[PDB]
Design a protein around this nucleic acid. Structure first.
Ligand SMILES: [Zn+2]
Ligand SMILES: [Zn+2]
Ligand SMILES: [Zn+2]
Ligand SMILES: [Zn+2]
Lengths: 379, 379
RNA sequence: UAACGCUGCGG
RNA sequence: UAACCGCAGCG
């Protein structure tokens, strides 16, 4: 063999990084794509082998796109290095196009020893059908598609930016932008839920659970002459964001993330039915925000199916009554809803829905509780 | 003499007004232009006669532009009312187009009894040559072109918005946007300065003034093979913004407004020489900001001609030395510069520059003072 | 900020 | 946020 010295990264200046890796989902003015690649081996506890920055205008003629430049460089690198399994990581500012995605899928087919992971700052044309198809080509060829969070921005700053020892300072709204982008990516990749996660979290057993977490599957329908027709695109599932110093410092409940996601869809003036299936009914704060949302969204009909009633140390009845008295339709999941969620949102791998013990009894009991809560008048 | 009832305006809801009248100079997403007109008689102590809101898409098929719809409405309105002098005021979200500007000029020529004043929220395509030509067509046909400030936004909110009694709440950065837009409008209409104002402010007599104030005329040239050639557009003059609760609460010195204006020009990577003529040499804070600006703009050469040395309660020498030691070229206006400013930026109305008594003597004295200030020792 | 630019046809 | 949209050729 012949030895190749590392090639210490020629870094980008801080202002270019701050401008080009701002993860505001809708951001105009960026004409260049920046890609920061790093090649390691199977072992993550061994120092990286090589890191290189590529850039390029987003102009058609994908020949000069940074993904193609990386492909050329890394073919050379592979011919010059030991033949073993390698793990490439990308920090790319925009999501790739169809042409580059097909080239990458082809290369991964040719070189099955390379595992590629892509962290994107922003999703590029996530509403355009063909860029969604590009993301699917990539995910299908093996690559792991992810959104850059605070940790990946910090690491990119450390490894690829001319910070001069100064620490990475995050911008305003980095967690909210990350939440929106992660949800949209889950939609575009049609990400399905872990079977065990589903059974553990959606079990309508009254309280017997672990530490409280809320899972929310969502789907959209549109009105067409007194019958609802599905919208296959805006469907998926999310969970509550736990408190995080560099995320949401006090957390974000599932319902709040969901109400954040709805306006990002940029729906029409037509009537939409947004249905969700939550393992816990909304808390009081969630209920207040959903009431305000319904109060201010004429064309949106909220259907809430809870698997359990969350008792928020007292406020649950009042919150449920406000939510019922302000617009939302609220039901408790019976068998049919659990089976539909298992079929639609769960990575069932072909296995049918196994009903946990006592499902129908628990569903009827929860229905009775909800009926008593709603019909308990005040004055 | 058949009577016409006023026609109480059907107001726009606060959502639409807040979105469409935000005065961020570069604002995408607004496809409609909203225009709120009000007709008075030639008397501010008499209640307005009529007020009407028009709206319309911004693109061609100019028939449906709100400017044309107002023209049609107001021709009829004139045919139905007493023939006298009228004062029309517009609050329009975007500056008008060439077709509408020509129609308005035509109407103003046909109907000389109408005086039209236009307050624009944002300048529409202020870099496109033809929209600037439209602004010039309007100003020359008689119309008074202005930018909406806080008072005009509050007035629009009261007279045309469904505020429901709530007071007008201003958005973030309204004064800064106003300054950018006011300077750009003065450039596009090539507004010249009052002769008396020039003589009063640029007199290089040492201190003898009133509650004095700093005026800054500015010009840009660009380099082409060892000779500087003019840029006729980015030339004009501004003054310091006095403290204002609804403007800059503490004020904005002329030099700071100028350094704010420079990046709005969106200059190139080519070398530009930006020359200014200020009635007062920069204060200490101005000097610090200009030093940092030069520190971060490689391609911009600042040439400062001061008519007087401002004695900033002690710190003027250190400020001037910092400005000199950080990039800026500093001179005192001799006769030639005063006459050039009189010719270029002053509404001289044809008459030549009359040099005030003792000009050359004062210029020599100020030049000597500046030379002594710059050539003072360090350690 | 629905997100590279120029040149055009139309709505 | 250089700022209505679709279609079409090129950088
Ligand atoms: Zn590409
Ligand atoms: Zn909650
Ligand atoms: Zn028009
Ligand atoms: Zn100052």
């Amino acid at each position: 063999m012949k030895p190749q010295i590392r090639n210490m990264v020629e870094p980008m200046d801080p202002r270019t990084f701050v401008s080009n890796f701002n993860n505001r989902p809708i951001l105009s003015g960026l004409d260049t794509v920046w890609l920061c690649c790093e090649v390691k081996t199977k072992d993550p506890s061994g120092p990286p082998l090589d890191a290189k920055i590529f850039q390029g205008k987003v102009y058609p003629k994908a020949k000069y796109h940074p993904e193609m430049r990386f492909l050329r460089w890394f073919h050379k690198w592979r011919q010059l290095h030991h033949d073993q399994e390698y793990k490439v990581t990308w920090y790319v500012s925009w999501s790739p196009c169809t042409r580059c995605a097909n080239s990458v899928a082809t290369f991964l087919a040719k070189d099955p020893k390379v595992t590629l992971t892509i962290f994107v700052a922003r999703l590029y044309y996530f509403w355009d059908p063909d860029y969604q198809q590009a993301l699917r080509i990539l995910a299908e060829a093996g690559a792991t598609m992810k959104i850059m969070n605070y940790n990946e921005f910090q690491d990119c700053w450390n490894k690829f930016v001319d910070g001069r020892g100064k620490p990475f300072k995050p911008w305003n709204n980095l967690p909210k932008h990350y939440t929106l982008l992660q949800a949209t990516l889950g939609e575009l990749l049609r990400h399905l839920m872990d079977p065990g996660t589903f059974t553990s979290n959606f079990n309508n057993k009254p309280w017997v659970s672990g530490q409280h977490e809320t899972y929310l599957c969502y789907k959209v329908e549109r009105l067409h002459n007194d019958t609802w027709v599905p919208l296959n695109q805006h469907r998926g599932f999310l969970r509550n964001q736990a408190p995080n110093i560099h995320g949401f410092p006090k957390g974000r409940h599932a319902a709040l993330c969901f109400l954040d996601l709805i306006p990002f869809w940029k729906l029409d003036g037509q009537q939409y039915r947004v249905t969700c299936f939550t393992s816990w009914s909304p808390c009081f704060s969630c209920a207040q925000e959903m009431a305000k949302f319904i109060s201010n969204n004429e064309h949106v009909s909220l259907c809430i199916f809870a698997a359990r009633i969350y008792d928020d140390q007292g406020r649950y009845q009042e919150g449920l009554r406000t939510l019922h008295r302000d617009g939302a339709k609220i039901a408790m999941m019976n068998y049919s809803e659990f089976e539909y969620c298992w079929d639609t949102f769960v990575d069932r791998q072909g296995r049918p829905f196994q009903p946990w013990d006592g499902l129908d009894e628990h569903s009827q009991a929860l229905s009775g509780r909800l009926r008593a809560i709603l019909q308990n008048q005040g004055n």
